[PDB]
Design a protein around this ligand. Structure first.
Ligand code: NAI
Ligand code: L5N
Ligand code: L5N
Ligand code: L5N
Ligand code: L5N
Lengths: 328, 328, 328, 328
């Protein structure tokens, strides 16, 4: 009699919460570790093209995961290891080389997504796609087109992280914990993003109401400088460290939690926005979405000034400007 | 009247669970992110010598921490930012250059710790020191000597991770969840480490009792191959990826949780072992320790065979062999 | 040599997060179990006057706590077991007998607090007092007077639970998760409580803005019926079951979490409100407070209509009407 | 246009982790609150026969659940509200009247289960049955027979709580945290239960090995007194308080966690034991079981002395003694 059979009388013998991370660069692995440690998944699948490096990240993560609610953790160049994923996070992309045009970068990303997205869909046809790759508003559009998925199951990391950053500085200024502050940053991810002053409050007391010169240039307190420092903060990280990993990792884990645990929470994420704010093109921008187990179940219809509406409309034009030139 | 003063009537105006990570290489930051995400600390302090890279890791971690129970997160070249740390994790070290002697490497690590440890102690005199730097059993001794701390407040990452790995394979073989398996790997971290077959059980049913030829060469099932595959697993990670980060990060977070939340849990960690197993020298090896808010409160006196006892004794000799030559 | 000494080599030999629950009725024990299971306390102290019943609730709770992060759990008629409590929850009360006057009931509660509060203070002088006993806005005042504590360390359960209930129905009506809805119920706990329509939003989009006839009687959708159903819900529980336990238990655990884990979260809790809304008497009502490790660190100055302000002012009069008649 | 439609643009429109508690007495509700607070279930169903009291417990629990990851919470006299339960906890039964025979009580419990179990099965045919009702080892058998479920999907609360209690006192004696102690109490729940000395260890160091006169009468340290104090502790709760609620609540929540979150953890729970310890009858006793999402997946074959084996065998006889007389 074997030792197994002497010790254990056995009576009995598919994952329900599988997550795939595509790309195991800094960002991919930051997503992966941040998702493990929120115990969101019973199976975690890693996919990249450098095979020896992929298997090492899988093994290192496996070994650490022994100190958690350990899920199944698998990896491969072949997308068959991503089968029956509830959620697939795309981090894979090309980084812009110096003197490369915006349009040229997007097209190289498009040519990559033309290999990735059809393989993801082949093996996980009812998954939600969460797009992290930059520039995120266009690459969400790209993944939507290639996948043929409905708009609810294609989401971009969007302004989730920029909004968190905004609320931190909002908090520092009012002497209030960031989580007690509310306020969104919507539209095109980075630089062109719109701080929405109308809906910024603490405990439902509107800041616009108390200080009606809030967003404006004749603002004694200069709250414009907040949205400026949010965007500078993104760059100062890259200047000092070389890249950002942790910040996007946890921002994505936050979005993954809302989807995987069906929290029906509000995130300013890139979604198909044709119909709203007088935009007639198939562009994606960040507006507040309820995220649940079926992805974006609802949008929250934010009332924007004509200034705010124009700044979005201008972003939607720039974005369609590139999208119409892309070859699928 | 400012917007802050119009909105908020204030009534009121030191951290109790501060953790310092020394070194923000792969391992340091894996420790840091893994500690953030277990919400162990109200203040987290990062210290390294490359100033621009340090500040970037701090900022990136800060930004991500907006999606957690956000602690204070600070960084500096100067150790004054580590003041009143309950726990300090040392990851800083020298890596062995080509043709460099084992003794010479340890002495360079000694000369580094002669700058680090006195600065750590100056600013956090009642802290626990958790040593992760390799070779860990000697560098724990080094930190103990330089700090003049009692043996309870100086701990090495030790065989915590190797034991977890062992128990995983133990589990796979018995068809039992790793956390339902018990069994230690003690002594010198890596290669020379001793699987303790006497104390390996499931639900208190000793495996040694059911299959008395367990550890031996005449073992039909060849359980020796388990401890072999544990050590090969460490290397296969380094061959494939370049280094290990995640696995030690979470292994250290596990030890930090036991200390910071006073769990009084048992970990096989490097501690001063003079008195036991006929060892008369001031050497550190991994034996089961109860970890709590005062560090190592208790040892568990494991009864070892003459083989096991000799393999430890031999490691203690090798280690004192280097320790006696070091210049403080 | 004993078995303890053969097995365990000992190296070493005060709680930092002690909570006392005063009163082990339905409500007290609901508080206690709800606080245990959020692992908020390293020591839990139970105090009541029926000694045999007290010790049984302690033992039953002890035995269950073996399946949690087990704290120390103690009990006594003598308040010396409450020493060094960070938080003391008063649930002790008299229940109104048939034909007893409202004033007479409050005075019996006062005569009880005249024994409890000085004993609590004697043994835990830097604690926060959380008052749950009804009528809660007056008994918070009573505990404030007897304790001589500053207004920041004396808090009443207040409208925390009523506001939660409101937001649930708000959610059901908008097809939004309760936690994505914001909106307070302020003032005198129950019946006289004021739904604050100005500050009710989803994702910062004010409901008042979209539907300016919200609070009013000429409201097509009849949102007044929400605050009505909140108050009826309190009664329908007592009619059907005899009392409420679970609801106040978890409402108090929520407030305890904010204090014990220093979350600096906003709760509509009873606090000293002289200075605000043209109120010159020492009365307590529910306004939004930031709760942290020092109790109420901040108030949020909510802008109220003249109707809302008058309804509060009227409650403050009624309450001072009773407070001035009480004998200390 | 409604306020809902002005605020929310909707895109989209069954529970996967439903738990039913049958009986909302002290024990039932302690189970319910303890299960809510471990966030195990997306739907919780309460069933009892007193309709007005049932609806009050549901409402009180509903209101408290607003401070958690709020599940759906329903109740009814009709079992149709228990449809698609992954786990059903039976607390309903009869208490022994004065001068009533043991056999007569069990038969009245049988006649109740003949209404409950077929209704549970009708609406949740693939559920796991967790039996809490006393006497638990017989009523588990009763539920197994009536349900026609396989032995893996019928589990009794068993000696889970007695074993926890044992380990606490074991810990107090060795100066070790209860969770660092291992040791089972197996067999018939209460009084006749067998402390298994062979498999009692700390960190895999067997206590039997260090002190071979452990269980015996010639034990200088008198460890027999531990199992005595475990059983006296059960009674002293009932003498002092009237009943036990919290202890069984959390003991059941522990078992529910292992099943609902597929932890594959070891619990000494009542299961069909024909085949083991020379027992040829269909009796249920507590032996170590791996609990997962399909209930009892595996048993751990504990080696027992002839004394231990005889004490179980004697319990199995007494139990079959009653079981053979029951009318289905
Ligand atoms: N929403 C809310 O805020 C609600 C609050 N309550 C309050 O909770 C309080 C307690 O109600 P329950 O615990 O449900 O039932 P309860 O009224 O039976 O229990 C309260 C306990 O106070 C104890 N007590 C009396 N004098 C004492 C002293 N000198 N020292 C220590 N303890 C003493 C009693 O023995 C009793 O066990 C009541 O005063 C009531 O006002 C009740 C219902 C709703
Ligand atoms: O691609 C492979 O080579 C591969 C992939 C998955 C597996 C199975 N698997 C897990 O899903 C999984 C999850 C988490 C941990 C884990 N393994 C370990 O941690 C260890 C393996 C060997 C040692 Cl030693 S530790 C494993 C693991 O081995 C094995 C091999
Ligand atoms: O090294 C510095 O110069 C330094 C150190 C600490 C701090 C204070 N501080 C925290 O302690 C802390 C914890 C967590 C987050 C965090 N800041 C933020 O996430 C953001 C800052 C600026 C933006 Cl934009 S987001 C901060 C933060 O700014 C600021 C600057
Ligand atoms: O007042 C008393 O009679 C008293 C109070 C606390 C204690 C010590 N104590 C704890 O602080 C504590 C916390 C959690 C559990 C717990 N005890 C138990 O679970 C058991 C005691 C006896 C058995 Cl049997 S189990 C205890 C416990 O016994 C002992 C006696
Ligand atoms: O049996 C019934 O009568 C019944 C059953 C389910 C429901 C729907 N439902 C939940 O599933 C549920 C879960 C948790 C809370 C909850 N209700 C509430 O929180 C409140 C109702 C009214 C106020 Cl005020 S709060 C509910 C709730 O109302 C309503 C009535």
């Amino acid at each position: 009699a074997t030792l197994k059979d002497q010790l254990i009388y056995n009576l009995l013998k598919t994952p329900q919460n599988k997550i795939t991370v595509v790309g195991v660069g800094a960002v991919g692995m930051a997503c992966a570790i941040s998702i493990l440690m929120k115990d969101l998944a019973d199976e975690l699948a890693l996919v990249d093209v450098i095979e020896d490096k992929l298997k090492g990240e899988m093994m290192d993560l496996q070994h650490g995961s022994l100190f958690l609610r350990t899920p199944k953790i698998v990896s491969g160049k072949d997308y068959n290891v991503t089968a029956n994923s509830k959620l697939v996070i795309i981090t894979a992309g090309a980084r812009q080389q110096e003197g490369e045009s915006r349009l040229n970068l997007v097209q190289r990303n498009v040519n990559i997504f033309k290999f990735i997205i059809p393989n993801v869909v082949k093996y996980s046809p009812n998954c939600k796609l969460l797009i992290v790759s930059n520039p995120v508003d266009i690459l969400t559009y790209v993944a939507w087109k290639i996948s043929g998925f409905p708009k609810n199951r294609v989401i971009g990391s969007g302004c989730n992280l920029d909004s968190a950053r905004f609320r931190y500085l909002m908090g520092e200024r009012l002497g209030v914990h960031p989580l007690s502050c509310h306020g969104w940053v919507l539209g095109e991810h980075g630089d062109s993003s719109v701080p929405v002053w109308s809906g910024m409050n603490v405990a439902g007391v509107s800041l616009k109401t108390l200080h009606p010169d809030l967003g404006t240039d004749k603002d004694k307190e200069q709250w414009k400088e907040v949205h400026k420092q949010v965007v500078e903060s993104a760059y100062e990280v890259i200047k000092l460290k070389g890249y950002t990993s942790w910040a996007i990792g946890l921002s994505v884990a936050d979005l993954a939690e809302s989807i995987m645990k069906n929290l029906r929470r509000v995130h300013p994420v890139s979604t198909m926005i044709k119909g709203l704010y007088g935009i007639k093109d198939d562009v994606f921008l960040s507006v507040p979405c309820i995220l649940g187990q079926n992805g974006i179940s609802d949008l929250v219809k934010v009332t924007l000034t004509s200034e705010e509406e124009a700044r979005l409309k201008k972003s939607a034009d720039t974005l369609w400007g590139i999208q119409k030139e892309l070859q699928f």
